[PDB]
Symmetry: C2
Subunit: 332 residues, 2 copies
């Protein structure tokens, strides 16, 4: 029923946003574009997870959706590649944003809190986007520095706004920490998808991986860092434990589904090995050279390509077998 | 130190506040230059804040209005895509200037909530209005005025209402806005009759609009503005401003099209 709350909230955000686009003279196409922004429409549900009163939660959630969609329309306006009418994009962008300020300011504890949060790192956000497009990233460090502005800072602001508007029991710092880590996991996902969905190359993480400029294991480490940052934020009292499966779902999806499209047979990291003694020598074979593998009690016995026709023999304790050997066990 | 001296100092102060803000958020020299060239846009906040008795509050509201007015002009450049400027800079500077304005306006407002009230109230009339304008173009003076009452009158009306909300109170808010809506349409006509060359001009030239009707509208807007600035407390300094912009359209611009 948490998965059902998250679907209903997306649908309620989609309803609020499309009505507002249509009420301002948005074309059916532009309405269909905003209704299509599924994760943008759902993300506000994540940011409001700490909100105890469900009437305030639903109201903060739709107001965040308005402004996130507005900024997405501004972005479509600066790319100017949607085929949507530019006048509609501009005027609907403005209208949604002004409705969002009104609604957020109606819910905030403090009258200045909304404009304080939007102003505080405006230069970092707006100058960040300019430099992202001005100087294309050529390695992971550059990719992350850019992504921390239009991804992390972008969504952190909506985290702070969710805390400011979300009444009592909101660990402001932690809502924002969650938002910033989660946004970077999503931003990596979008780069690794939009390589092919959108034909994107310059500054694109997938292009940097395929090119050799960025190593798969560095990408895996960043994803694991972002997973751990988001998990820590959601464990801070009074806690948002409902967000734990969400964090795993998005990180795992990048690891399992998207990364492999830009790496290849080997994958990320060094080729796994089996260490054993055999006729008195120290021996170490690549999981790639291993042929047959079978269990006898807690021993794993196996054969390998030793060079030429030559077949080698070994056995190790299951305690000293890498996961990759035990996997071939299960698959033989 | 007369009134044209106060205006000149206000216009320079608004320009400097805008250019510093564009430069510091990563605006290129072409975008900084573009922003500094928006003379009337940087000037008009001075007129809007004529009812503000504290000179320091007046300087602060004037420059805040200038940030947002320039912001909305940059959004307008972004929807036309005809300046040859970088769309990423346009968008990012548009956003930054606007967010600074919200911050500076809310810090001056009696009630910070009044800023987002004023901006939301007729947001649909303004934004729906601009879509309808750029869709189905005017073929007579009635249609032209209908369209210009959104992107001109409602546009500047909002900044009128914001000036009164961020001013020193007693300020006659309805009259500030009435001044702004009437004056806005005078300068929108002026812009239309300049921006043909450098659309009301096309209609005057192909005789779909009679000169005498344009004169009558200008005289009506002149009277509306003079009435607004005679409501108490009163902004007598705006009388010569109304005459200057009106007479300029009658004397300099109309003859170019008749």
């Amino acid at each position: 029923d948490d998965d059902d709350k998250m679907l209903a909230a997306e649908a309620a955000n989609r309803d609020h946003v499309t009505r507002c686009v249509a009420q301002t003279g948005g074309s059916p196409d532009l309405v269909a574009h905003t209704a299509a922004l599924r994760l943008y429409l759902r993300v506000p549900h994540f940011l409001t997870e700490w909100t105890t009163d469900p009437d305030r939660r639903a109201a903060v959630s739709r107001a965040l959706a308005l402004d996130i969609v507005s900024m997405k329309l501004l972005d479509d306006l600066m790319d100017d590649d949607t085929g949507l009418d530019r006048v509609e994009l501009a005027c609907v962008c403005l209208r949604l944003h002004l409705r969002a300020l009104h609604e957020l300011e109606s819910l905030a504890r403090d009258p200045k809190a909304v404009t304080d949060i939007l102003e505080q790192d405006a230069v970092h956000l707006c100058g960040g986007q300019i430099r992202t497009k001005r100087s294309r990233a050529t390695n992971l460090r550059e990719w992350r520095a850019h992504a921390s502005t239009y991804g992390s800072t972008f969504l952190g602001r909506y985290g702070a706004l969710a805390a400011a508007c979300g009444g009592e029991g909101q660990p402001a710092d932690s809502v924002r920490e969650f938002a910033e880590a989660f946004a970077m996991t999503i931003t990596m996902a979008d780069d690794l998808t939009d390589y092919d969905r959108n034909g994107e190359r310059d500054g694109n993480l997938a292009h940097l991986m395929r090119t050799g400029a960025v190593a798969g294991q560095d990408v895996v480490d960043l994803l694991e860092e972002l997973r751990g940052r988001a998990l820590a934020a959601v464990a801070a009292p009074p806690g948002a434990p409902g967000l734990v499966p969400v964090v795993h779902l998005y990180t795992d999806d990048v690891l399992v589904r998207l990364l492999p499209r830009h790496l290849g047979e080997a994958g990320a990291g060094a080729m796994a090995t089996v260490k054993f003694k055999y006729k008195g020598e120290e021996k170490e074979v690549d999981i790639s050279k291993i042929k047959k593998v079978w269990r006898v009690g807690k021993m794993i016995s196996f054969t390998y390509d030793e060079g030429g026709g030559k077949t080698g023999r070994g056995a190790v304790s299951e305690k000293d077998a890498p996961k990759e050997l035990l996997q071939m066990l299960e698959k033989q």
